[PDB]
Amino acid sequence: TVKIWVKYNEGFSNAVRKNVTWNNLW
Amino acid sequence: ALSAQQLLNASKIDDIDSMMGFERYVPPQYNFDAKDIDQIPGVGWLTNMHATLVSQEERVTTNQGISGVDFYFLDEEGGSFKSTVVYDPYFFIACNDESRVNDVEELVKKYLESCLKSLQILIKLSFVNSNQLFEARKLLRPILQDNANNNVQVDAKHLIEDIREYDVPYHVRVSIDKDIRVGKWYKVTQQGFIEDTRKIAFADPVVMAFAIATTKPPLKFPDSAVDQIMMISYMIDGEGFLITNREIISEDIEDFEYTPKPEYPGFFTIFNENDEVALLQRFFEHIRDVRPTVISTFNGDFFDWPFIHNRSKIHGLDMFDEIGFAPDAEGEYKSSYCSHMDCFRWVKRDSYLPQGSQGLKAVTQSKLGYNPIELDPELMTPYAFEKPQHLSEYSVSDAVATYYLYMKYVHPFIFSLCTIIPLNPDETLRKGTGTLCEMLLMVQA
Amino acid sequence: SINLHSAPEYDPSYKLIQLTPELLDIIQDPVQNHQLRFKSLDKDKSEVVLCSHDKTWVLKQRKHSNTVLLMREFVPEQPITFDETLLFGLSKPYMDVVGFAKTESEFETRETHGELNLNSVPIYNGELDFSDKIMKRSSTKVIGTLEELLENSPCSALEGISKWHKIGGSVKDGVLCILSQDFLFKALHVLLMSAMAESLDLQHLNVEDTHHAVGKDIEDEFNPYTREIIETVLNKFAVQEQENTWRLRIPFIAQWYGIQALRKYVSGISMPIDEFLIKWKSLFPPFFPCDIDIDMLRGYHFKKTVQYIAKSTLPMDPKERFKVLFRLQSQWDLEDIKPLIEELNSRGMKIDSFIMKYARRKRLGKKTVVTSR
Amino acid sequence: PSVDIDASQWQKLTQSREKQTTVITPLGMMMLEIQGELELPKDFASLARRDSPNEGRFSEQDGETLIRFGSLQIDGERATLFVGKKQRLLGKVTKLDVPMGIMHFNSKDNKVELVDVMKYKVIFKDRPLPI
């Protein structure tokens, strides 16, 4: 037991583009 | 009696035509050679033609109609007009004994006084209009029957053996005799239409292609008595539009792109209407606004058009008054100013496809070389509520496919065929290949 | 094979930026002014743009549901000891890398139009003692240089300078400002008349000779036309060849004059077009006999009648703008309306689609015009 | 506010080396992508002490305990990822349509520096498999 593994995702969702604030960066 | 009603229909058609930018143009009084052209006042690309009846416009001879043909033209300046030619309709009588043709002449001179406009040496018979011609045929047919029955080998009646060139459509008779063809360029002059042999490249018509989506019951066919239109997609000269009925489609659809090949751009603009009638009114108004001279569909003669007509009637609208379209004697939907190009007909006649390939999809794959969006029809109604974006992607995919199917294959073929055959696009599309053949041989002879 | 190692905590200071071929070319240029620069108007509200020396891009973030690890090669301090348990589909390891960053999004860049920051720019009307109107403002911070203006503006250097010259921006007593329409064009007229009075070569005008030719007559106390003002006028109505001399354009100035005529005569009351063409026509300040064209009479007026309209006074929201536009003129010309909506597309794509989506396209034989509902 | 991107080091290293040929950047950096969430232990310190020499699963680098969690194998377009002793994921080496720039944002001085340019990635879109 206790072996490293990877939680597989069933699907791949791709978000829509968004505006960038100065606060989002820093 | 029925004359004046055909004149009423004519006048309504004149109103439709003028509303859509086809006013009757009348060239200047005459006065040289057809070879030094442009020295004559007037130029247009001919896109359609229809039989019609026209008024006169010492003795005025009371009120009576004139047989003629309307020709529809697009000008060099991005505009359009229509113009009208008058011509006496005619047909011939043959005799089995030449020596006494004159007695026959006198007989018929008397016998056909009520319908006949003139006669001249076969015996050529000319008439004031199509109705009188038809009365002459009704008067002559029993004689010809008895005659055809008679075995022969002395009385005048019995000397007329037959009629020849008797089943030529009037518009065809005119197109042939005047040597005019759709798809060619003419200068309209008082002397007549002058072919411009210098211009071969086609002008660019306004082209609309459309597909509708409607509700239907499970495992049954759509019925226009109870089912509603939920969306209408269309394209105009490469620009897409989609109109929506928000009584059914449970959200506003937003503008989007569907472009399956660079050849086929599809930018669609959306019109979200509150209900069916609004959708219809937006549709009709858009049609009046853009003025198509081709409208294309896929199986619109059997599905789309009668459905649109019936929903139109249900909301108290008169489609004929709105856009000039109505069913003909075959039950097909036609107008004067705009050709109805049902691509499915071309598919069935000229495409070489298997019954297995008579679907929109298989035609798309075969002819445009790509794989369009597919949706089980039974799923179309529920998704209208549940997944409206997918349905709208399907709808516009349909419109793109229909547009480029028309533009890449059907338009050049049908119009070029029109450039040698004396028919409008609709008929050349719909006639049997055999009748087409008949027409070609008639031209050659 | 490659041995994969991982840190207990990743540094989120590292971010992924999409690099277009153009942006790559820009990156790979030793001297592109300040190379690439991140620019923004404020800290908590405005958007952030990336600017090169001659172009401006808008940034767009896009998240994904996958695990992206940025790893780097390292030389292990201690020899990696491990028993080989499977050889299948495996070659002997020859290097060690460690993931120092885990990104969940990418940054797409889109070509966009650069704009100027006119926050602290005053209006100059030719008024004396302007310093008091400068120092007694809300923003104690005063725009000292053009560099400072560009640094606090959402645009590239060249776009910024081009637009600054396009709007007739200038500087008086060390303070940037914008000249009023009246004073700017009056300055233009005076410049023209003075230049022709001294028979100056219009194709090759310079600052010194022009400046000397203008303020030679008028007393200095009433002469606000310094060399910077002249340079502004030249940068507005002329094009330089070697970049050092200036060469005047012609259609822009005459059309602009038609606009001046517009602010004077059809701001208060409207009048039928044939009449307006006559009256407009009676106005000929420039010595040069101007030509009329229907294209010249488009974008500054609305309708068989005509009335002046300023673009700045129209609402900035598209739907409201179209609403008020449908309130103002029942029937529109195509060419009359194209320049009036070109600058303000919220979609930012195409021209015709905007028009049909927000109006009713109702073409006619002469031209494909627009109509209202 | 505004600040320039420093790309001098990246330029000097780029000019003196190739355009990227395999997945390794000329600078010795790469990009790994997994369709999923990487599940790691909650107590690194404890396992680093109970870690035995035979396993060699943990090591110290500059005061930080790194774990060796897997192996990556490139046999061409085909790629295989081994995780732990018992997990295998199948994937591919793909050329990025849009090259990704790795940049370091120094919050302290508000300075941005270009770290490297990724032209390729090793991606795994398929379900993890048995050993």
PDB file of C-alpha atoms in Angstrom, chain B residues 77-251:
ATOM      1  CA  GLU B  77     -24.341  49.460 -61.387  1.00  0.00           C
ATOM      2  CA  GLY B  78     -25.521  47.047 -58.692  1.00  0.00           C
ATOM      3  CA  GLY B  79     -29.175  47.722 -59.416  1.00  0.00           C
ATOM      4  CA  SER B  80     -32.008  45.865 -61.118  1.00  0.00           C
ATOM      5  CA  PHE B  81     -35.032  46.302 -63.371  1.00  0.00           C
ATOM      6  CA  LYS B  82     -37.588  44.377 -65.415  1.00  0.00           C
ATOM      7  CA  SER B  83     -38.816  44.874 -68.967  1.00  0.00           C
ATOM      8  CA  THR B  84     -41.634  43.440 -71.034  1.00  0.00           C
ATOM      9  CA  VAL B  85     -41.888  42.077 -74.570  1.00  0.00           C
ATOM     10  CA  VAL B  86     -45.146  41.628 -76.446  1.00  0.00           C
ATOM     11  CA  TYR B  87     -45.569  38.979 -79.123  1.00  0.00           C
ATOM     12  CA  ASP B  88     -48.549  37.355 -80.845  1.00  0.00           C
ATOM     13  CA  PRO B  89     -48.869  33.678 -79.852  1.00  0.00           C
ATOM     14  CA  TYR B  90     -49.418  31.325 -82.783  1.00  0.00           C
ATOM     15  CA  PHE B  91     -49.831  27.733 -83.957  1.00  0.00           C
ATOM     16  CA  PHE B  92     -50.213  25.951 -87.301  1.00  0.00           C
ATOM     17  CA  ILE B  93     -52.808  23.971 -89.263  1.00  0.00           C
ATOM     18  CA  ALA B  94     -51.812  21.343 -91.847  1.00  0.00           C
ATOM     19  CA  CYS B  95     -53.984  20.241 -94.787  1.00  0.00           C
ATOM     20  CA  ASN B  96     -54.031  16.890 -96.581  1.00  0.00           C
ATOM     21  CA  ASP B  97     -55.119  18.522 -99.849  1.00  0.00           C
ATOM     22  CA  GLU B  98     -53.172  21.685-100.679  1.00  0.00           C
ATOM     23  CA  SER B  99     -55.312  22.753-103.650  1.00  0.00           C
ATOM     24  CA  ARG B 100     -58.300  23.691-101.492  1.00  0.00           C
ATOM     25  CA  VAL B 101     -56.486  25.256 -98.517  1.00  0.00           C
ATOM     26  CA  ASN B 102     -58.214  28.499 -99.406  1.00  0.00           C
ATOM     27  CA  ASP B 103     -61.639  27.007 -98.832  1.00  0.00           C
ATOM     28  CA  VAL B 104     -60.412  25.790 -95.488  1.00  0.00           C
ATOM     29  CA  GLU B 105     -59.107  29.280 -94.907  1.00  0.00           C
ATOM     30  CA  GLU B 106     -62.504  30.746 -95.609  1.00  0.00           C
ATOM     31  CA  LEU B 107     -64.213  28.170 -93.449  1.00  0.00           C
ATOM     32  CA  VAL B 108     -61.970  28.840 -90.532  1.00  0.00           C
ATOM     33  CA  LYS B 109     -61.986  32.560 -91.335  1.00  0.00           C
ATOM     34  CA  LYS B 110     -65.639  32.294 -90.473  1.00  0.00           C
ATOM     35  CA  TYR B 111     -65.480  29.517 -87.867  1.00  0.00           C
ATOM     36  CA  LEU B 112     -62.792  31.091 -85.671  1.00  0.00           C
ATOM     37  CA  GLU B 113     -63.856  34.752 -85.868  1.00  0.00           C
ATOM     38  CA  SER B 114     -64.504  34.933 -82.111  1.00  0.00           C
ATOM     39  CA  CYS B 115     -60.965  34.012 -81.042  1.00  0.00           C
ATOM     40  CA  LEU B 116     -58.666  34.651 -83.977  1.00  0.00           C
ATOM     41  CA  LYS B 117     -56.415  37.689 -84.340  1.00  0.00           C
ATOM     42  CA  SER B 118     -54.990  36.776 -87.737  1.00  0.00           C
ATOM     43  CA  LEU B 119     -53.850  34.103 -90.175  1.00  0.00           C
ATOM     44  CA  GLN B 120     -51.236  33.733 -92.914  1.00  0.00           C
ATOM     45  CA  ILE B 121     -49.704  31.208 -95.328  1.00  0.00           C
ATOM     46  CA  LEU B 122     -49.028  25.412 -93.406  1.00  0.00           C
ATOM     47  CA  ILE B 123     -51.639  27.854 -92.150  1.00  0.00           C
ATOM     48  CA  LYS B 124     -50.192  30.031 -89.394  1.00  0.00           C
ATOM     49  CA  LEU B 125     -52.804  31.194 -86.893  1.00  0.00           C
ATOM     50  CA  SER B 126     -52.110  34.149 -84.590  1.00  0.00           C
ATOM     51  CA  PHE B 127     -54.128  35.276 -81.568  1.00  0.00           C
ATOM     52  CA  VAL B 128     -54.658  38.237 -79.245  1.00  0.00           C
ATOM     53  CA  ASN B 129     -54.021  36.097 -76.177  1.00  0.00           C
ATOM     54  CA  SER B 130     -53.501  32.623 -74.725  1.00  0.00           C
ATOM     55  CA  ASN B 131     -57.145  32.181 -73.746  1.00  0.00           C
ATOM     56  CA  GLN B 132     -58.361  32.773 -77.288  1.00  0.00           C
ATOM     57  CA  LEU B 133     -55.705  30.376 -78.553  1.00  0.00           C
ATOM     58  CA  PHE B 134     -57.025  27.792 -76.105  1.00  0.00           C
ATOM     59  CA  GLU B 135     -60.584  28.365 -77.279  1.00  0.00           C
ATOM     60  CA  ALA B 136     -59.386  27.798 -80.823  1.00  0.00           C
ATOM     61  CA  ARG B 137     -57.786  24.541 -79.725  1.00  0.00           C
ATOM     62  CA  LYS B 138     -61.028  23.537 -78.008  1.00  0.00           C
ATOM     63  CA  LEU B 139     -62.944  24.262 -81.231  1.00  0.00           C
ATOM     64  CA  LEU B 140     -60.418  22.410 -83.425  1.00  0.00           C
ATOM     65  CA  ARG B 141     -59.778  19.339 -81.253  1.00  0.00           C
ATOM     66  CA  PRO B 142     -63.007  17.436 -82.030  1.00  0.00           C
ATOM     67  CA  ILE B 143     -62.396  17.840 -85.768  1.00  0.00           C
ATOM     68  CA  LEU B 144     -58.852  16.556 -85.317  1.00  0.00           C
ATOM     69  CA  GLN B 145     -60.140  13.594 -83.306  1.00  0.00           C
ATOM     70  CA  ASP B 146     -62.689  12.534 -85.964  1.00  0.00           C
ATOM     71  CA  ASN B 147     -59.910  13.233 -88.492  1.00  0.00           C
ATOM     72  CA  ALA B 148     -57.411  10.998 -86.694  1.00  0.00           C
ATOM     73  CA  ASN B 149     -60.128   8.382 -86.516  1.00  0.00           C
ATOM     74  CA  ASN B 150     -60.953   8.754 -90.235  1.00  0.00           C
ATOM     75  CA  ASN B 151     -58.915   6.476 -92.515  1.00  0.00           C
ATOM     76  CA  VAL B 152     -59.020   8.899 -95.497  1.00  0.00           C
ATOM     77  CA  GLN B 153     -56.306   8.101 -98.063  1.00  0.00           C
ATOM     78  CA  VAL B 154     -64.277  15.760 -99.762  1.00  0.00           C
ATOM     79  CA  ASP B 155     -65.688  18.471 -97.501  1.00  0.00           C
ATOM     80  CA  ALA B 156     -63.606  21.333 -96.145  1.00  0.00           C
ATOM     81  CA  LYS B 157     -63.717  20.350 -92.471  1.00  0.00           C
ATOM     82  CA  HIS B 158     -62.254  16.977 -93.302  1.00  0.00           C
ATOM     83  CA  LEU B 159     -59.187  18.445 -95.059  1.00  0.00           C
ATOM     84  CA  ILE B 160     -57.268  19.579 -91.929  1.00  0.00           C
ATOM     85  CA  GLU B 161     -55.086  16.541 -91.158  1.00  0.00           C
ATOM     86  CA  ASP B 162     -53.108  17.811 -88.143  1.00  0.00           C
ATOM     87  CA  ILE B 163     -51.359  20.426 -86.024  1.00  0.00           C
ATOM     88  CA  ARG B 164     -47.604  20.921 -85.642  1.00  0.00           C
ATOM     89  CA  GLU B 165     -45.408  22.712 -83.071  1.00  0.00           C
ATOM     90  CA  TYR B 166     -48.560  22.641 -80.967  1.00  0.00           C
ATOM     91  CA  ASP B 167     -47.305  22.044 -77.429  1.00  0.00           C
ATOM     92  CA  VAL B 168     -44.618  24.694 -77.126  1.00  0.00           C
ATOM     93  CA  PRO B 169     -44.775  26.707 -73.875  1.00  0.00           C
ATOM     94  CA  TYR B 170     -45.394  30.398 -74.593  1.00  0.00           C
ATOM     95  CA  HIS B 171     -42.334  31.673 -72.738  1.00  0.00           C
ATOM     96  CA  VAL B 172     -40.328  29.070 -74.634  1.00  0.00           C
ATOM     97  CA  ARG B 173     -41.858  30.073 -77.957  1.00  0.00           C
ATOM     98  CA  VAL B 174     -40.801  33.659 -77.255  1.00  0.00           C
ATOM     99  CA  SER B 175     -37.325  32.777 -75.955  1.00  0.00           C
ATOM    100  CA  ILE B 176     -36.746  30.726 -79.119  1.00  0.00           C
ATOM    101  CA  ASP B 177     -38.237  33.092 -81.698  1.00  0.00           C
ATOM    102  CA  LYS B 178     -36.501  36.167 -80.258  1.00  0.00           C
ATOM    103  CA  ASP B 179     -33.300  34.188 -79.566  1.00  0.00           C
ATOM    104  CA  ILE B 180     -32.979  35.314 -75.946  1.00  0.00           C
ATOM    105  CA  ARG B 181     -31.335  33.280 -73.169  1.00  0.00           C
ATOM    106  CA  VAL B 182     -31.029  33.703 -69.396  1.00  0.00           C
ATOM    107  CA  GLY B 183     -27.392  33.921 -68.298  1.00  0.00           C
ATOM    108  CA  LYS B 184     -26.510  36.105 -71.257  1.00  0.00           C
ATOM    109  CA  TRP B 185     -26.138  39.869 -71.372  1.00  0.00           C
ATOM    110  CA  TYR B 186     -28.471  42.075 -73.361  1.00  0.00           C
ATOM    111  CA  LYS B 187     -28.936  45.734 -74.085  1.00  0.00           C
ATOM    112  CA  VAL B 188     -32.665  46.441 -74.101  1.00  0.00           C
ATOM    113  CA  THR B 189     -33.624  48.685 -76.994  1.00  0.00           C
ATOM    114  CA  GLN B 190     -36.799  49.555 -78.898  1.00  0.00           C
ATOM    115  CA  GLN B 191     -35.474  47.383 -81.728  1.00  0.00           C
ATOM    116  CA  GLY B 192     -35.295  44.603 -79.161  1.00  0.00           C
ATOM    117  CA  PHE B 193     -32.783  42.823 -76.969  1.00  0.00           C
ATOM    118  CA  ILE B 194     -29.205  42.951 -78.242  1.00  0.00           C
ATOM    119  CA  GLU B 195     -26.822  40.209 -77.109  1.00  0.00           C
ATOM    120  CA  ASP B 196     -23.449  41.451 -75.899  1.00  0.00           C
ATOM    121  CA  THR B 197     -21.043  38.855 -77.308  1.00  0.00           C
ATOM    122  CA  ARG B 198     -18.206  40.770 -75.618  1.00  0.00           C
ATOM    123  CA  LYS B 199     -19.420  39.854 -72.125  1.00  0.00           C
ATOM    124  CA  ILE B 200     -19.210  36.217 -71.042  1.00  0.00           C
ATOM    125  CA  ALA B 201     -18.331  36.335 -67.329  1.00  0.00           C
ATOM    126  CA  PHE B 202     -21.503  36.117 -65.240  1.00  0.00           C
ATOM    127  CA  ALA B 203     -22.794  38.907 -63.028  1.00  0.00           C
ATOM    128  CA  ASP B 204     -23.242  38.187 -59.328  1.00  0.00           C
ATOM    129  CA  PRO B 205     -26.836  37.589 -58.190  1.00  0.00           C
ATOM    130  CA  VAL B 206     -27.934  38.012 -54.590  1.00  0.00           C
ATOM    131  CA  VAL B 207     -28.022  34.439 -53.312  1.00  0.00           C
ATOM    132  CA  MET B 208     -29.923  33.177 -50.277  1.00  0.00           C
ATOM    133  CA  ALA B 209     -29.968  29.576 -49.067  1.00  0.00           C
ATOM    134  CA  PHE B 210     -32.064  28.473 -46.095  1.00  0.00           C
ATOM    135  CA  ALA B 211     -33.040  25.586 -43.828  1.00  0.00           C
ATOM    136  CA  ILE B 212     -35.700  25.510 -41.104  1.00  0.00           C
ATOM    137  CA  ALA B 213     -35.958  23.385 -37.974  1.00  0.00           C
ATOM    138  CA  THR B 214     -39.366  22.384 -36.587  1.00  0.00           C
ATOM    139  CA  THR B 215     -40.862  20.274 -33.800  1.00  0.00           C
ATOM    140  CA  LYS B 216     -42.442  16.884 -34.514  1.00  0.00           C
ATOM    141  CA  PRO B 217     -43.963  13.965 -32.583  1.00  0.00           C
ATOM    142  CA  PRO B 218     -41.934  10.824 -31.651  1.00  0.00           C
ATOM    143  CA  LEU B 219     -41.719   8.167 -34.391  1.00  0.00           C
ATOM    144  CA  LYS B 220     -43.985  10.270 -36.621  1.00  0.00           C
ATOM    145  CA  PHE B 221     -43.619  12.845 -39.380  1.00  0.00           C
ATOM    146  CA  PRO B 222     -43.821  16.627 -38.830  1.00  0.00           C
ATOM    147  CA  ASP B 223     -47.384  17.934 -39.137  1.00  0.00           C
ATOM    148  CA  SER B 224     -47.798  21.634 -39.870  1.00  0.00           C
ATOM    149  CA  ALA B 225     -51.280  21.658 -38.350  1.00  0.00           C
ATOM    150  CA  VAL B 226     -49.826  21.358 -34.849  1.00  0.00           C
ATOM    151  CA  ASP B 227     -46.018  21.512 -34.856  1.00  0.00           C
ATOM    152  CA  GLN B 228     -44.197  24.834 -34.685  1.00  0.00           C
ATOM    153  CA  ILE B 229     -41.050  26.216 -36.291  1.00  0.00           C
ATOM    154  CA  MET B 230     -38.351  26.585 -33.647  1.00  0.00           C
ATOM    155  CA  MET B 231     -35.494  27.999 -35.753  1.00  0.00           C
ATOM    156  CA  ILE B 232     -34.671  29.265 -39.231  1.00  0.00           C
ATOM    157  CA  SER B 233     -31.074  29.363 -40.503  1.00  0.00           C
ATOM    158  CA  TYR B 234     -29.951  30.992 -43.735  1.00  0.00           C
ATOM    159  CA  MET B 235     -27.026  32.430 -45.682  1.00  0.00           C
ATOM    160  CA  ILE B 236     -26.800  35.496 -47.908  1.00  0.00           C
ATOM    161  CA  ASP B 237     -23.743  35.858 -50.170  1.00  0.00           C
ATOM    162  CA  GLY B 238     -21.553  34.045 -47.667  1.00  0.00           C
ATOM    163  CA  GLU B 239     -22.896  35.678 -44.511  1.00  0.00           C
ATOM    164  CA  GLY B 240     -24.914  33.673 -42.007  1.00  0.00           C
ATOM    165  CA  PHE B 241     -28.051  34.443 -40.034  1.00  0.00           C
ATOM    166  CA  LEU B 242     -30.080  32.420 -37.549  1.00  0.00           C
ATOM    167  CA  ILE B 243     -33.562  33.318 -36.261  1.00  0.00           C
ATOM    168  CA  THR B 244     -34.950  31.761 -33.077  1.00  0.00           C
ATOM    169  CA  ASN B 245     -38.372  31.130 -31.499  1.00  0.00           C
ATOM    170  CA  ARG B 246     -37.914  31.631 -27.741  1.00  0.00           C
ATOM    171  CA  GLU B 247     -41.263  30.017 -26.929  1.00  0.00           C
ATOM    172  CA  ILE B 248     -39.424  26.767 -27.602  1.00  0.00           C
ATOM    173  CA  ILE B 249     -35.708  27.508 -27.470  1.00  0.00           C
ATOM    174  CA  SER B 250     -35.168  27.992 -23.759  1.00  0.00           C
ATOM    175  CA  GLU B 251     -32.316  30.484 -24.053  1.00  0.00           C
TER     176      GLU B 251
END
